[PDB]
Swiss-Prot record:
It comes from Homo sapiens. This is Orexin-A. The gene is HCRT. Coiled coil: none annotated. The modification Pyrrolidone carboxylic acid is found at Q1. The chain holds residues 34 to 66 of 131 of the full protein. The modification Leucine amide is found at L33. Disulfide bonds join C6-C12, C7-C14. Binds to orexin receptors HCRTR1/OX1R and HCRTR2/OX2R with a high affinity. Stimulates food intake. Modulates pituitary luteinizing hormone secretion in an ovarian steroid-dependent manner.
Amino acid sequence: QPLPDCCRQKTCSCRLYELLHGAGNHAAGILTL
């Protein structure tokens, strides 16, 4: 999977993606399409 954006710009937590990727990864996969 893709790396964290906030981690690249250091504008927020990197594990932020894991939050949704674990509590609902499909939510982002479908909403994005």
